[PDB]
Curated annotation (Swiss-Prot), chain D:
Zn(2+) binds at residues 9, 12, 30, 33. This is Transcription initiation factor IIB. A zinc finger (TFIIB-type) spans 5-38. Associates with TFIID-IIA (DA complex) to form TFIID-IIA-IIB (DAB-complex) which is then recognized by polymerase II. The chain holds residues 16 to 173 of 345 of the full protein. Present with 6750 molecules/cell in log phase SD medium. Belongs to the TFIIB family. The gene is SUA7.
């Protein structure tokens, strides 16, 4: 079943960009379709302080949403059981959206450091740019002054940092490859 | 920019002091230079009216004749004329009029057509890269031939 | 294809292959829009196609998508032969055998160019194409 | 930046200025050339008469209390609310200690001077592994 | 780009010159204070035309300072720079990052980080100049510049251009 790969993918990201404890609750929720609240509680045998945000993260991750699995109490009351409805369609909605968000962000970091164009005065600790440089450039001053401190300017965003963002990208592409490949394998059916 | 969107002071809807509209007033660095002396001579004519109570040799002195007329803190005017005359490739004001009759018959925005005149341009592709706005506005065949007609009007002192 | 599509989106066969995984005419590898657009915007930069160093040129690319780039390059070499022999005298007199012989020569020029195993006529074919271009220009 | 203004008589410029300040006329004048350098001098006298800055410094907290236009449900609501943010600083010991010495010196009739002088001592150290606590009382007494 | 434009101005005529020939003085003030000046909104000013026929309608006296001031609507000649268009010019100044070109009255500068690759600075030239793979750009050399950056400070404009593309460089 492809839905298992979705759950299998959910383990990867919840263990790749999250901790190990983030998958045991993910295991527990997906262990049973309609699982009682206490049954999950006895599995971990720890406090709710180490369990609450894990489900809240998963509900915020939109992979699984706690559903109102209504149960009729036997004591002339109505107390429901907290069974999560694993929201597979929203999983690809949320998780992939971040991947698209981070990749363009790291793409932004690439061209920011790609070539040193903006300038800066270390005395004033303020960045500048070429358009500021030219209007500040003088025939006598072959460099760029800083009228705020009356100091020469220095360049910013040297060529080294462009490699760092690319190396971030290369790690980004490699480390998200198992996530996306397991995500794009779901794109065939959208389940 | 190159999208024919400059400051609103340079739209087609240009307004005189009396509210009347006409297309933008744009001149090439030769046609403008031609109007420079003649208008200034009129002021020098008015200067003397109130006073009563190659091409490089004549370049400076004529401009010096008018540098003497005004305050002269506009020696850049000479420099502009130096920028103009060294780079203005027209003469014989009737040349512009036919060129205006010619270039503006194409329905081109006067800054664009003046840039055709102002730039020593020969080919259609030459205008394809120099003037990005004027690449496909007109068929490039017309470009060269009109430029060649202008290239036929090369007056080289 | 299945896993060779991009330095960024490598497994792009099932990753919504909608972005142009175009091929630079001087790079001959699948480069996704996530990658190529980062490159030609600034100019002739090289792409990290598994650590590749070939230059992705300026805004002068071509469409090659899912047409066996290597064979397409051979087809392009054939197309280059077809372009070099666009005005080649084959049936100027109508002789079919001569055209059959002439067709073999143009294909051999493509064959020399598109093979690369021991390509030495390939450089000569370019000179022959230049000779053809000399015939074509004059 | 260098963020500095220093008056200098342009006509004389003879030195770091030898000038005077006619406070009554609210100006400053070149004592030799007599040119008024800067005018509209601003008073700073009546500002403080209406009015711990020595020890705590820029760590800020404003003493507050109930209002007249307020109910008893508004009175003890504030007295409960005024203590729920005291965690943000560790001057709470100090605000008790500075209170405590204030109780200490005054009770045995020490002069008010010792109140701040003892305050000066505690805020001086306030933290050392040589102290590492140290009964919390020597740091007081 | 070079233009002739119709502009409005506000002269403030100090009371001292209130003689009957103030009209002459008004025409006097305009010319000597404008021709040779610049505006961020309208570029440099070289020449004023139509001297005889300029609107000089009336003068409103200020509340204080008693200096009657006039509104003048006049037509002159101007140069206005922009971005995205090519300008032919004269190389005048230069620095380590590139060279500066005379454009009308404006001294436009061009930087390498926009200039073509094969062109680079070669300090060996006297005067210092830039050798390309095809030519070399010296001071008097006619250079066409496509302006790509210009800032219009009030009464002053400075432009940054490039010679990256074709039909450029030394002419
Ligand atoms: Zn500074
Ligand atoms: Zn990619
Ligand atoms: Zn003095």
């Amino acid at each position: 079943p492809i839905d298992d790969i979705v759950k299998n993918l959910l383990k990867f990201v919840v263990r790749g960009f999250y901790g190990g404890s983030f998958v045991l609750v993910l295991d527990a929720i997906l262990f049973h379709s309609v699982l009682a609240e206490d049954d999950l509680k006895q599995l971990l045998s720890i406090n709710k302080t180490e369990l609450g945000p894990l489900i809240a993260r998963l509900r915020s991750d939109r992979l699984i949403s706690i559903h109102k699995q209504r149960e009729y109490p036997p004591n002339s009351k109505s107390v429901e059981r907290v069974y999560y409805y694993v929201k597979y369609p929203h999983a690809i909605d949320a998780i992939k959206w971040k991947v698209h968000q981070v990749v363009q962000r790291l793409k932004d970091d690439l061209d920011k450091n790609s070539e040193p164009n903006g300038y800066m005065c270390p005395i004033c600790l303020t960045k500048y740019t070429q358009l500021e440089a030219v209007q500040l450039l003088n025939f006598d001053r072959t460099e760029f002054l800083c009228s705020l401190c009356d100091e020469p300017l220095v360049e910013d965003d040297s060529g080294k940092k462009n490699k760092e963002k690319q190396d971030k990208l290369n790690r980004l592409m490699d480390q998200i490859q198992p996530i996306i490949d397991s995500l794009k394998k779901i794109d065939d059916s959208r389940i | 920019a190159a999208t024919l969107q400059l400051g609103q002071e340079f739209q087609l809807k240009q307004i005189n002091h009396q509210g009347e509209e006409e297309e933008l007033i744009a001149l090439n660095l030769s046609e403008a230079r031609l109007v420079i002396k003649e208008a200034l001579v009129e002021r020098r004519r008015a200067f003397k009216r109130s006073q009563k109570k190659t091409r490089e040799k004549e370049l400076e002195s004529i401009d010096v004749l008018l540098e003497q007329t005004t305050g002269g803190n506009n020696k850049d005017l000479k420099n502009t004329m130096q920028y103009l005359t060294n780079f203005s490739r027209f003469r014989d004001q009737e040349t512009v009029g036919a060129v205006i009759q010619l270039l503006k018959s194409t329905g081109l925005h006067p800054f664009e057509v003046a840039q055709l005149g102002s730039l020593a341009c020969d080919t259609a592709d030459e205008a394809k890269t120099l003037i990005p706005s004027l690449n496909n506005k007109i068929s490039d065949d017309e470009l060269e031939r009109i430029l060649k007609e202008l290239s036929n009007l090369e007056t080289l002192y | 294809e299945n896993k060779d599509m991009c330095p960024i989106c490598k497994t792009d066969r099932y990753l919504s292959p909608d972005v142009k995984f175009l091929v630079n005419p001087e790079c001959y590898h699948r480069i996704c829009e996530s990658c190529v657009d980062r490159i030609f915007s600034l100019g002739p930069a090289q792409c990290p196609y598994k650590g590749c160093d070939k230059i992705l040129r300026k805004n002068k690319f071509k469409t090659q998508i899912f047409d066996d780039v290597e064979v397409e390059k051979e087809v392009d070499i054939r197309k280059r032969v077809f372009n070099v022999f666009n005005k080649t005298i084959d049936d100027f007199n109508g002789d079919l055998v001569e055209y059959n012989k002439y067709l073999e020569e143009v294909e051999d020029i493509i064959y020399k160019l598109d093979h690369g195993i021991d390509v030495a006529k390939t450089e000569e074919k370019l000179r022959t194409y230049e000779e053809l271009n000399k015939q074509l220009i004059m | 930046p260098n963020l500095n203004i220093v008056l200098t008589c342009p006509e004389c410029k003879v030195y770091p200025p030898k000038i005077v300040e006619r406070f009554s006329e609210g100006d400053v004048v070149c004592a030799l050339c007599g040119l008024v350098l800067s005018d509209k001098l601003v008073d700073t006298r009546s500002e403080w008469r209406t009015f711990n800055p020595l020890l705590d410094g820029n760590n800020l907290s404003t003493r507050i209390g109930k209002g007249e236009t307020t109910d008893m449900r508004f009175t003890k609501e504030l007295n409960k609310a005024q203590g729920k943010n005291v965690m943000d600083k560790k001057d709470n010991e100090v605000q008790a200690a500075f209170a405590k010495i204030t109780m200490l010196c005054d009770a045995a009739e020490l002069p008010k001077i010792v109140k701040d002088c003892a305050k000066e001592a505690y805020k001086l150290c306030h933290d050392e592994k040589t102290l590492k606590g140290k009964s919390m009382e020597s740091i007081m007494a | 780009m070079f233009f002739i434009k119709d502009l409005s101005l506000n002269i403030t005529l100090h009371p001292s010159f209130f003689g009957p020939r103030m009209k002459q003085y008004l025409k006097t003030k305009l010319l000597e204070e404008v021709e040779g000046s610049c505006t961020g909104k309208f570029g440099y000013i070289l020449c004023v035309l139509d001297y005889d026929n300029i609107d000089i309608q009336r003068g409103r006296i200020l509340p204080t300072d008693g200096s009657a001031e006039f509104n003048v609507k006049y037509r002159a000649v101007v140069f206005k720079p922009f971005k995205g268009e090519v300008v032919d010019g004269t190389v005048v100044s230069c620095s380590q990052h590139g060279f500066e070109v005379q454009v009308g009255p404006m001294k436009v500068f061009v930087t390498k980080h926009l200039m073509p690759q094969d062109l680079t600075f070669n300090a060996g030239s006297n005067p210092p100049s830039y050798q390309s793979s095809e030519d070399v750009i010296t001071i008097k050399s006619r250079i066409r510049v496509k302006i790509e950056g210009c800032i219009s400070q009030v009464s002053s404009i400075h432009a940054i251009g490039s010679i990256k593309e074709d039909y450029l460089g030394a002419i």
